[PDB]
């Protein structure tokens, strides 16, 4: 039963990962929520990926930018930038990584295994359309690859003739034991973000970690806010002035209300496996309706996080004006949060 | 009777605000010219709005950016930026304001009433599709609103159940009396521009006030030039190398000739209240053909104003080249203004 | 007969200037390759132009940005910027010029005649739809032109009533004797790039000059790399992470291999007159299959050049990782170029 | 001052031919209203053309189908169908003609001169991009034209090198003196409709002539209704179930009210020479608000005319239903016109 | 856990009505599945609507065509065609109705209440964007309505100023005593289809009712197949050569396998509330995986039903060919069903 | 060197099959020309296919329609229609076949081998995106297929795990000994057209076979004209009033001149392997400039062939009109061909 205040035609704004197709491979599985599942999304698409301990996410690159939140476990990522500088790191649950457009990279689960959420900067992304190393070489002439590698063709007899995508491997050693020497050195700012290094803005019902370009300098395309709200609390009525919002609910149960313009309003129930979308500058709230902390990510195709809270808007507006607006006494306006 | 020099298929570039449907409300009226009326417009849309003394344009926001030229009267504007800092000011005829995308604001006419022109950073804008405070709260559950405001549900019984848009109010007190304290402070650069602060570039036939981001720093999306051309004068043949041009004619009568590419040319007569469009990098002139000084706004979806004049181009081009081009002697080409 | 490793549906990527329609004029000829010829090109379009000694390319402008490589001969360019500062220079084979959007300019061949390649910042550009001075003036009322020049209309009796486009003239004098005085002075950074000022990056089989905004400051829209590859040489396997690639072969014979995503691969034979396109972030190689040096241009709609080589990528990647990927031992992997 | 019952954003639906550019030629003039003037039109475009006595509209053809209503004067039209069959006729004020897609034809005014309205089956038509006989031959090699006509090239010496479009001529002789012999014979059904052959449907306030494919068999693409409404009369509330409606107001002053769905309503005043558009299945009324008979054409891109009257709908609806809907007693519902 | 025989990226093809937002009214409720929920749907949109006894679905029309399947209960429909002929009928569960584009109609539940499925001839339809009688009259001037009904304005004082959409009423009397006298008579063929008049085609695993234009003459836009499959049964491997398929599952549990081209295949699990889509000419099967009979609707935007069965295709094909294809002996090919 | 009469921007209208990628399979080869090679084509796409004697083109179907011309050799086709009726026939060079949308079919070369041209009813077609029998079953679960065929899964052990597309087989026996029995019988009209059954209309320089739905009833989507032009002859100036033209040149060298509207004209040379495009209603000619007869196919997405010749148009127009048009004498006009 929807609220008495819902009205008009608003698109579906919710899709569960459990309704997504499961590509299962030895060493892990993958599934995605794209604009082919949720057409209200115009900026971002999400992939939920899981790797068994030591399993590879095959070396690859793509036209889109990658933003990743570590759901569980631990993993190692490697990458190379456009100036020939290399990057290597290990991360645990709660951490992020970020590869801007066309930056090649790898992921390998460590002893714990891993599950992570990836966000891609085009709404029509697909994991089955990424540029894979083994696919690339499987479709390059062996004389050409031999000339490139400066070796003889016989050495390349056992190159795969078909991609691996996600495949099993052994847990690697320590970084200092595996890191390869590069005369260009490392990338000047990490492609990774370790989350204890940031402390969250605390509000009444919970906490918010804001990770944008001002916190994570390489993240020039996608930014996010990790929100944790205790039971009975609520993310207050607000909107984002610059961009559509793309949500992934990590844990808990929420009631989400969205008001587009023109008497348009809809309310949805979200839970821990769901992706949601808030249209651009649409006014919305997210209320905890479960007994455990509600954790989710607001993600945006925008290097800068920004939002606007209704309470703040009214607090800075002349009191007689808000009173004439809301048909409530100035005295009662004066007691709203500030 | 068009000039014999006109040729080819050129879109219509003229539309009168008097030919737009007028939304009249208790306390004011509004009418708009968009790509639903002038499809040659690809960047901007115009709104002509009128407020009775003390009347509010309801607290609201939109996805688009706002640029406003004050036609008549006086008014007060309030706003809040993305970092929580507030803004309040009074403006008179000739002044400007600017709200970048998603910045909420209110307008209240003062004792004189006011008429103003608003320009929006999308060609398909509509005043009837704005995000209104009362609409938002009318479509939010009352328990949710109460929890947000941290008050009891009964307090919100007299909340409007329907938008106000433009409604009557009493002329407010002085800012020094009505302003609210904000621990975040004021916005660092005003959302307002007082036009007496600006000196015009003066040429033979008139004056041009140029207001772009180097003059009006918050205006990062839309910039403009106010042009006044005396009787017998002309805006010389020129073009803008980076963007389409959108005109509003304040006063006077003009003959405007536009040359798109490929032997396409069309001539229009404009008068006060007309909206016009010059295609991107199209060559054009604007001649005063009336008894009175001609005043209009050239407005652009571009942070930097720029143009290129024909006479300057020829004066800097080698004389033999201009001579071979125009079949005119070097001596008289040397006679052109520089 | 295509290689066994090619697979799938890849668009055509090759189009010959010899297959483009030739507009012949008094004083020169022109032909173009656009997405009306090569729909896989989404960013840029190419124009091949030839001018007889002393011949004019008519004074003109366009919405698009111009990046030009001088194929043969010598020529003079003139231009004017938005701040009223002028530019004039002479250039030889191998030199470049660049006029950003809407910057008006002219070209005149010198004693040798000239042939040059122009690349434009929209894939649907057209040489037959540029903004011509005489086309403009032929479609402006003569009273208006008279007022603009403030001459009497008698002087304008011989204005062309029709474009000239490309017309004959005398080889002009030295810059020092023909240059016109401009109180605003010259442009602060040249619209020209003399290739003798830049040393090539040299690798084993050849050389490449990289010219982008860090080398050629006015070129904020288009960048390029001029590549020369000795017989038996090859441009090593790589991709461009940010942009589509647009190629013009100057001289020689090449075999070009392209790997799009999803096991998509195609091989092409390219020749002296040919235009090619490599899709965004597509992996590719370019092998010289002739006995004369292969010269070509990689051009991009991007102010910064960027690429990533497979050799460097594997070089910076952990050896066990590369070995697990490619089904070859660490020992032979340790033998790849770096 | 719009009715208080108007609401919401409705496109502009009115455009006056007097605001369209007038292409004037020796022997006549032309002007058009297309989606470049009235973007709410998605099906049809209008042309208002005037020919001096004996004047030709040049032999031509186009991709679109044209429907013509003769406003004043008399004319002769000729055409050819796809089976090699020819057609020739004379027509007067009030008469129609119809040329399906690609059917070539000519128009020549007779002694009175003529003005006529043409309607075209694409909203983006323009008269300046029609296929002209002289244009065609002016851009065909003269040897090719010579071989085609089986003649030698010097008779083609005075072939126009440029179109004629509208040029002067002598009022031709009688058809029985002028008709050329065609072994394929005449077309089986005339490309013309003489309006005196048609009985009007008579209603309370006026007359309706309905001409669709059941009446005018060749007009398989465009149909129409000529409506005349007496002073004080009204075109009753109705809608057209299958297509958009395109109007030309021949004479009088009208108030036209349009209701799209979702509480969207707009009201316009129309006068002679105005073109209007009613969106698909939109409900509308047309009231005469002048003292002279209101005459206009409702035109549709549809071979069959159809409409549905509100009064008829209510009369055929169960009385308790109409009452339950309108909160009016059965006693009153039984009194509506049926 | 998907089958291994699945591969590649196929859009989501399943959406549950229970995940669609519910519009609740006094007397009924509504919910829809469109391409805002199911973007793979390119032809049709679905509405699940339920009415309380005596409740009206308001008199209305829409630009799209309506095809309706009666899920439960009984109801009365009324309509009017383009020739002024009337229609009224009652239907029970399992029956259909059909209103082509713009045909006005009403629905009123009888004593039992009703639930029905509506399918509309555009994928972006919306129940909240329908043309309602009262919405229309609420936005028509009262003087205009007074003239239209030929009554004085005092009678129209109680006209709704706002839509009703779905509202309560009394179960009406028999058609014979409530039917209104229309001098134009009844429509020539009913807008209704009583399913007991049609015998199903029987196959061993179930039954198929095929309803297209040859059986239901007014239904010229949408046709359907009602399929019932016993436990252990299967709708054999087949495709439809001319159209997309739009599915609504009435009862049961199904496993549906879809094979698009190019090794793309996906399998879904369907049940009672679900909507599905089969892309055009895609090969598919539907297996009953429950204990109860599986009942569903295959619906098409196509007046004629068509399919092609794999078994028949192979049976009519030369056995040497089928054997050469499938690597099966001829004798085994000879025992496939035919 | 293009004619003096060419002018303006025309798309490229030519592409050679020799420039298309050739997919080689044991037993044959295939290559295609689509809008990824020739973006001016908006209706049709071409495939050039060659099958070794006895080789199969795998059993398949597609969304688009097939119209095919037999270039050389002989072949056998099989198909099944939507009413369960089967078709089988063998054909030789010069014959056609036609399978409407979604009609499944097979091709097998006979003793001679075969090469044929296929034309498809969408411009973005690709042979590598066809629905293949083995692809379908290889991506269908084998339990499902076994239940479908009512066999044991053991039987399905050797089903391919991958498409066959083009594979070798033995040249089959006579139709009467291989045709399978079908209780529904054969299709009422053949999907094949034997060209010896058609007499060509003979004109002066050559012959024309016109094959459309009035000649070839199953061909309701694509029609064609086979044109043979003797040396020194020419296909006269003409245009097609209803559709774009798609050409394939069987034999010879041609000069083709195309006139779009608005002074747009371009001329191309076509030869033995070329595909061409003529825009809709564009006026054009095709002249033989070789020493052998020029044979080509004009193909159209239109069930009815139609064209309009300039000579017929002028012969049927009043002579004074043609004379005033062309500035030619009435007597010289009267000697034009008729
Ligand atoms: Mn990745
Ligand atoms: Mn938010
Ligand atoms: Mn300007
Ligand atoms: Mn240029
Ligand atoms: Mn490259
Ligand atoms: Mn015409
Ligand atoms: Mn009407
Ligand atoms: Mn309905
Ligand atoms: Mn089916
Ligand atoms: Mn032709």
Tab-separated table of N, CA, C and O in Angstrom, chain A residues 56 58-61 78 80 82 84 86 101-102 104 106 129 131 133-141 144 147-150 155 158-160 164 167 178 180 182 184, chain C residues 5 7 204 234 236-239 241-242 255 259-263 265 281-282 285 287 307-308 310-319 321 324-327 332 337-338:
chain	number	residue	atom	x	y	z
A	56	UNK	N	41.301	-14.855	-10.337
A	56	UNK	CA	41.560	-13.633	-11.081
A	56	UNK	C	40.283	-13.061	-11.678
A	56	UNK	O	39.434	-13.795	-12.194
A	58	UNK	N	40.120	-11.191	-14.876
A	58	UNK	CA	41.146	-11.148	-15.914
A	58	UNK	C	41.539	-9.715	-16.261
A	58	UNK	O	40.709	-8.802	-16.240
A	59	UNK	N	42.825	-9.537	-16.571
A	59	UNK	CA	43.365	-8.278	-17.071
A	59	UNK	C	42.509	-7.713	-18.194
A	59	UNK	O	42.233	-8.399	-19.180
A	60	UNK	N	42.105	-6.451	-18.052
A	60	UNK	CA	41.143	-5.876	-18.984
A	60	UNK	C	41.154	-4.356	-18.883
A	60	UNK	O	41.824	-3.766	-18.029
A	61	UNK	N	40.382	-3.733	-19.775
A	61	UNK	CA	40.122	-2.300	-19.757
A	61	UNK	C	38.774	-2.064	-20.427
A	61	UNK	O	38.208	-2.962	-21.058
A	78	UNK	N	45.867	-4.289	-9.566
A	78	UNK	CA	47.012	-3.733	-10.278
A	78	UNK	C	46.530	-2.879	-11.445
A	78	UNK	O	45.470	-3.126	-12.023
A	80	UNK	N	47.985	0.370	-14.615
A	80	UNK	CA	48.992	1.177	-15.291
A	80	UNK	C	48.335	2.450	-15.810
A	80	UNK	O	47.224	2.401	-16.349
A	82	UNK	N	48.551	6.387	-17.974
A	82	UNK	CA	48.882	6.778	-19.341
A	82	UNK	C	50.331	7.225	-19.482
A	82	UNK	O	50.872	7.214	-20.597
A	84	UNK	N	52.927	5.665	-18.149
A	84	UNK	CA	53.824	4.541	-17.934
A	84	UNK	C	54.100	4.236	-16.485
A	84	UNK	O	54.988	3.435	-16.188
A	86	UNK	N	53.022	2.697	-12.758
A	86	UNK	CA	52.318	1.497	-12.334
A	86	UNK	C	51.707	1.702	-10.951
A	86	UNK	O	52.090	2.602	-10.198
A	101	UNK	N	38.678	6.255	-17.387
A	101	UNK	CA	38.427	5.630	-18.687
A	101	UNK	C	39.685	5.063	-19.336
A	101	UNK	O	40.694	5.758	-19.483
A	102	UNK	N	39.611	3.787	-19.731
A	102	UNK	CA	40.644	3.126	-20.506
A	102	UNK	C	41.880	2.717	-19.736
A	102	UNK	O	42.823	2.188	-20.344
A	104	UNK	N	43.999	0.284	-17.806
A	104	UNK	CA	43.960	-1.174	-17.655
A	104	UNK	C	44.231	-1.586	-16.218
A	104	UNK	O	44.945	-0.904	-15.480
A	106	UNK	N	43.759	-5.107	-13.072
A	106	UNK	CA	43.473	-6.464	-12.633
A	106	UNK	C	42.972	-6.479	-11.194
A	106	UNK	O	43.330	-5.625	-10.379
A	129	UNK	N	31.285	-7.204	-22.307
A	129	UNK	CA	31.833	-6.388	-23.382
A	129	UNK	C	33.056	-5.611	-22.912
A	129	UNK	O	33.269	-4.474	-23.335
A	131	UNK	N	37.308	-5.243	-22.588
A	131	UNK	CA	38.442	-5.580	-23.441
A	131	UNK	C	39.400	-6.470	-22.662
A	131	UNK	O	40.145	-5.988	-21.806
A	133	UNK	N	42.524	-9.229	-22.105
A	133	UNK	CA	43.861	-9.524	-22.611
A	133	UNK	C	43.882	-10.804	-23.439
A	133	UNK	O	44.389	-10.819	-24.571
A	134	UNK	N	43.351	-11.897	-22.885
A	134	UNK	CA	43.399	-13.169	-23.595
A	134	UNK	C	42.541	-13.136	-24.848
A	134	UNK	O	42.936	-13.696	-25.871
A	135	UNK	N	41.381	-12.478	-24.796
A	135	UNK	CA	40.579	-12.288	-26.003
A	135	UNK	C	41.357	-11.513	-27.066
A	135	UNK	O	41.412	-11.914	-28.242
A	136	UNK	N	41.998	-10.414	-26.652
A	136	UNK	CA	42.795	-9.591	-27.557
A	136	UNK	C	43.849	-10.430	-28.265
A	136	UNK	O	43.938	-10.428	-29.498
A	137	UNK	N	44.644	-11.179	-27.497
A	137	UNK	CA	45.727	-11.943	-28.108
A	137	UNK	C	45.189	-13.133	-28.895
A	137	UNK	O	45.792	-13.546	-29.892
A	138	UNK	N	44.056	-13.699	-28.469
A	138	UNK	CA	43.423	-14.765	-29.234
A	138	UNK	C	42.973	-14.281	-30.601
A	138	UNK	O	42.783	-15.103	-31.505
A	139	UNK	N	42.777	-12.968	-30.771
A	139	UNK	CA	42.410	-12.433	-32.076
A	139	UNK	C	43.484	-11.514	-32.658
A	139	UNK	O	43.183	-10.593	-33.424
A	140	UNK	N	44.755	-11.772	-32.318
A	140	UNK	CA	45.872	-11.113	-32.984
A	140	UNK	C	46.741	-12.168	-33.661
A	140	UNK	O	46.996	-13.225	-33.071
A	141	UNK	N	47.185	-11.933	-34.897
A	141	UNK	CA	48.016	-12.933	-35.579
A	141	UNK	C	49.268	-13.257	-34.777
A	141	UNK	O	49.892	-12.376	-34.186
A	144	UNK	N	52.318	-11.391	-35.599
A	144	UNK	CA	52.294	-10.032	-35.065
A	144	UNK	C	52.637	-10.026	-33.579
A	144	UNK	O	53.443	-9.210	-33.121
A	147	UNK	N	56.304	-10.655	-33.179
A	147	UNK	CA	57.076	-9.449	-33.457
A	147	UNK	C	56.993	-8.465	-32.295
A	147	UNK	O	57.994	-7.842	-31.924
A	148	UNK	N	55.803	-8.315	-31.710
A	148	UNK	CA	55.615	-7.411	-30.578
A	148	UNK	C	56.422	-7.848	-29.362
A	148	UNK	O	57.144	-7.044	-28.758
A	149	UNK	N	56.300	-9.119	-28.981
A	149	UNK	CA	57.017	-9.678	-27.842
A	149	UNK	C	58.489	-9.932	-28.128
A	149	UNK	O	59.220	-10.274	-27.191
A	150	UNK	N	58.931	-9.784	-29.383
A	150	UNK	CA	60.334	-9.959	-29.767
A	150	UNK	C	60.838	-11.373	-29.471
A	150	UNK	O	61.979	-11.569	-29.070
A	155	UNK	N	57.205	-20.326	-28.892
A	155	UNK	CA	56.983	-20.027	-27.485
A	155	UNK	C	55.519	-19.709	-27.215
A	155	UNK	O	55.010	-20.011	-26.126
A	158	UNK	N	50.974	-22.099	-26.648
A	158	UNK	CA	49.946	-22.410	-25.661
A	158	UNK	C	49.120	-21.202	-25.233
A	158	UNK	O	48.388	-21.300	-24.243
A	159	UNK	N	49.220	-20.076	-25.939
A	159	UNK	CA	48.348	-18.945	-25.649
A	159	UNK	C	46.886	-19.375	-25.771
A	159	UNK	O	46.538	-20.104	-26.708
A	160	UNK	N	46.013	-18.952	-24.856
A	160	UNK	CA	44.589	-19.302	-24.969
A	160	UNK	C	43.982	-18.833	-26.283
A	160	UNK	O	44.330	-17.776	-26.810
A	164	UNK	N	39.309	-16.108	-20.612
A	164	UNK	CA	39.109	-16.727	-19.310
A	164	UNK	C	38.175	-15.924	-18.422
A	164	UNK	O	37.414	-16.514	-17.649
A	167	UNK	N	38.926	-16.630	-13.537
A	167	UNK	CA	39.532	-17.952	-13.445
A	167	UNK	C	40.355	-18.076	-12.169
A	167	UNK	O	40.747	-17.082	-11.553
A	178	UNK	N	56.215	-9.360	-4.842
A	178	UNK	CA	55.752	-9.595	-6.202
A	178	UNK	C	55.891	-8.372	-7.106
A	178	UNK	O	55.863	-8.497	-8.332
A	180	UNK	N	56.887	-5.553	-9.514
A	180	UNK	CA	57.873	-5.499	-10.574
A	180	UNK	C	58.443	-4.093	-10.685
A	180	UNK	O	57.763	-3.094	-10.423
A	182	UNK	N	59.775	-0.659	-12.161
A	182	UNK	CA	59.315	0.260	-13.200
A	182	UNK	C	60.133	1.544	-13.128
A	182	UNK	O	60.034	2.284	-12.125
A	184	UNK	N	59.688	4.352	-14.389
A	184	UNK	CA	58.815	5.514	-14.266
A	184	UNK	C	58.270	5.704	-12.861
A	184	UNK	O	57.694	6.761	-12.574
C	5	UNK	N	42.613	-15.203	-37.394
C	5	UNK	CA	42.253	-14.650	-36.096
C	5	UNK	C	41.230	-13.522	-36.176
C	5	UNK	O	40.746	-13.075	-35.133
C	7	UNK	N	37.456	-12.064	-36.794
C	7	UNK	CA	36.184	-12.649	-36.381
C	7	UNK	C	35.133	-11.562	-36.179
C	7	UNK	O	35.466	-10.442	-35.778
C	204	UNK	N	62.459	1.500	-31.868
C	204	UNK	CA	63.444	0.652	-32.563
C	204	UNK	C	63.272	0.702	-34.063
C	204	UNK	O	64.238	0.871	-34.820
C	234	UNK	N	57.028	-1.921	-37.102
C	234	UNK	CA	55.654	-2.068	-36.645
C	234	UNK	C	55.417	-1.154	-35.448
C	234	UNK	O	56.278	-1.030	-34.576
C	236	UNK	N	53.914	-0.919	-32.058
C	236	UNK	CA	53.662	-2.030	-31.149
C	236	UNK	C	52.207	-2.033	-30.682
C	236	UNK	O	51.529	-1.003	-30.684
C	237	UNK	N	51.739	-3.211	-30.268
C	237	UNK	CA	50.357	-3.394	-29.843
C	237	UNK	C	49.995	-2.435	-28.718
C	237	UNK	O	50.667	-2.387	-27.684
C	238	UNK	N	48.912	-1.689	-28.914
C	238	UNK	CA	48.541	-0.644	-27.969
C	238	UNK	C	47.091	-0.246	-28.205
C	238	UNK	O	46.437	-0.715	-29.142
C	239	UNK	N	46.596	0.627	-27.328
C	239	UNK	CA	45.299	1.263	-27.493
C	239	UNK	C	45.359	2.667	-26.914
C	239	UNK	O	46.261	3.006	-26.142
C	241	UNK	N	43.345	5.179	-24.507
C	241	UNK	CA	42.319	4.986	-23.471
C	241	UNK	C	41.186	6.004	-23.470
C	241	UNK	O	40.156	5.752	-22.827
C	242	UNK	N	41.337	7.135	-24.147
C	242	UNK	CA	40.390	8.230	-24.024
C	242	UNK	C	39.619	8.554	-25.290
C	242	UNK	O	38.619	9.277	-25.202
C	255	UNK	N	49.590	-2.777	-42.842
C	255	UNK	CA	48.594	-3.735	-42.381
C	255	UNK	C	48.181	-3.309	-40.978
C	255	UNK	O	49.027	-3.220	-40.084
C	259	UNK	N	41.218	-4.833	-32.686
C	259	UNK	CA	40.457	-5.689	-31.786
C	259	UNK	C	39.520	-4.765	-31.016
C	259	UNK	O	39.957	-4.025	-30.125
C	260	UNK	N	38.250	-4.778	-31.413
C	260	UNK	CA	37.163	-4.301	-30.574
C	260	UNK	C	36.914	-5.321	-29.460
C	260	UNK	O	37.659	-6.284	-29.280
C	261	UNK	N	35.858	-5.107	-28.692
C	261	UNK	CA	35.546	-5.983	-27.577
C	261	UNK	C	35.037	-7.323	-28.111
C	261	UNK	O	35.071	-7.605	-29.314
C	262	UNK	N	34.625	-8.190	-27.184
C	262	UNK	CA	33.757	-9.336	-27.460
C	262	UNK	C	34.267	-10.161	-28.639
C	262	UNK	O	33.513	-10.498	-29.555
C	263	UNK	N	35.574	-10.437	-28.653
C	263	UNK	CA	36.202	-11.274	-29.674
C	263	UNK	C	36.025	-10.723	-31.087
C	263	UNK	O	36.072	-11.481	-32.070
C	265	UNK	N	37.378	-8.669	-34.220
C	265	UNK	CA	38.675	-8.324	-34.773
C	265	UNK	C	38.584	-8.213	-36.286
C	265	UNK	O	37.856	-8.967	-36.939
C	281	UNK	N	39.275	3.126	-27.480
C	281	UNK	CA	39.996	2.157	-26.652
C	281	UNK	C	40.194	0.801	-27.334
C	281	UNK	O	40.559	-0.179	-26.675
C	282	UNK	N	39.974	0.723	-28.646
C	282	UNK	CA	40.231	-0.515	-29.370
C	282	UNK	C	41.729	-0.814	-29.412
C	282	UNK	O	42.556	0.088	-29.575
C	285	UNK	N	47.436	-2.715	-33.824
C	285	UNK	CA	48.814	-2.638	-34.291
C	285	UNK	C	48.820	-2.146	-35.732
C	285	UNK	O	47.844	-2.316	-36.471
C	287	UNK	N	51.529	-2.404	-38.940
C	287	UNK	CA	52.759	-2.988	-39.458
C	287	UNK	C	53.047	-2.453	-40.854
C	287	UNK	O	52.149	-2.396	-41.696
C	307	UNK	N	48.420	7.036	-24.719
C	307	UNK	CA	48.346	5.657	-25.167
C	307	UNK	C	48.884	4.737	-24.080
C	307	UNK	O	49.541	5.173	-23.131
C	308	UNK	N	48.615	3.447	-24.253
C	308	UNK	CA	49.041	2.401	-23.336
C	308	UNK	C	49.517	1.230	-24.176
C	308	UNK	O	48.776	0.740	-25.034
C	310	UNK	N	50.831	-2.670	-24.736
C	310	UNK	CA	50.689	-3.996	-24.147
C	310	UNK	C	51.983	-4.427	-23.463
C	310	UNK	O	51.956	-5.006	-22.369
C	311	UNK	N	53.125	-4.162	-24.104
C	311	UNK	CA	54.414	-4.547	-23.538
C	311	UNK	C	54.631	-3.921	-22.164
C	311	UNK	O	54.990	-4.615	-21.206
C	312	UNK	N	54.401	-2.608	-22.045
C	312	UNK	CA	54.551	-1.941	-20.753
C	312	UNK	C	53.552	-2.479	-19.737
C	312	UNK	O	53.893	-2.696	-18.567
C	313	UNK	N	52.311	-2.704	-20.175
C	313	UNK	CA	51.274	-3.225	-19.291
C	313	UNK	C	51.676	-4.559	-18.675
C	313	UNK	O	51.611	-4.737	-17.453
C	314	UNK	N	52.114	-5.505	-19.508
C	314	UNK	CA	52.525	-6.802	-18.983
C	314	UNK	C	53.797	-6.657	-18.164
C	314	UNK	O	53.995	-7.390	-17.186
C	315	UNK	N	54.652	-5.698	-18.558
C	315	UNK	CA	55.928	-5.438	-17.903
C	315	UNK	C	55.740	-5.008	-16.463
C	315	UNK	O	56.501	-5.424	-15.585
C	316	UNK	N	54.714	-4.209	-16.194
C	316	UNK	CA	54.462	-3.724	-14.843
C	316	UNK	C	53.571	-4.649	-14.017
C	316	UNK	O	53.359	-4.384	-12.828
C	317	UNK	N	53.057	-5.700	-14.600
C	317	UNK	CA	52.179	-6.692	-14.006
C	317	UNK	C	52.981	-7.834	-13.389
C	317	UNK	O	53.977	-8.283	-13.961
C	318	UNK	N	52.534	-8.313	-12.229
C	318	UNK	CA	53.211	-9.433	-11.566
C	318	UNK	C	53.407	-10.615	-12.508
C	318	UNK	O	52.531	-10.945	-13.310
C	319	UNK	N	54.586	-11.240	-12.419
C	319	UNK	CA	54.957	-12.272	-13.384
C	319	UNK	C	54.068	-13.503	-13.267
C	319	UNK	O	53.666	-14.080	-14.286
C	321	UNK	N	51.029	-13.479	-12.387
C	321	UNK	CA	49.752	-13.080	-12.970
C	321	UNK	C	49.774	-13.214	-14.491
C	321	UNK	O	48.864	-13.807	-15.091
C	324	UNK	N	49.872	-16.958	-15.375
C	324	UNK	CA	48.554	-17.562	-15.215
C	324	UNK	C	47.609	-17.142	-16.331
C	324	UNK	O	46.727	-17.916	-16.721
C	325	UNK	N	47.774	-15.923	-16.852
C	325	UNK	CA	46.906	-15.463	-17.932
C	325	UNK	C	47.234	-16.146	-19.254
C	325	UNK	O	46.347	-16.707	-19.910
C	326	UNK	N	48.503	-16.117	-19.657
C	326	UNK	CA	48.892	-16.434	-21.025
C	326	UNK	C	49.299	-17.888	-21.238
C	326	UNK	O	49.635	-18.259	-22.368
C	327	UNK	N	49.269	-18.713	-20.194
C	327	UNK	CA	49.690	-20.119	-20.262
C	327	UNK	C	51.125	-20.272	-20.767
C	327	UNK	O	51.442	-21.165	-21.562
C	332	UNK	N	59.872	-17.237	-19.897
C	332	UNK	CA	59.673	-16.589	-21.190
C	332	UNK	C	58.954	-15.256	-21.047
C	332	UNK	O	59.159	-14.358	-21.872
C	337	UNK	N	59.713	-7.348	-24.036
C	337	UNK	CA	60.302	-5.997	-24.046
C	337	UNK	C	59.668	-5.084	-23.027
C	337	UNK	O	58.527	-5.267	-22.595
C	338	UNK	N	60.460	-4.122	-22.571
C	338	UNK	CA	59.923	-3.270	-21.514
C	338	UNK	C	60.173	-1.807	-21.768
C	338	UNK	O	59.347	-1.147	-22.401
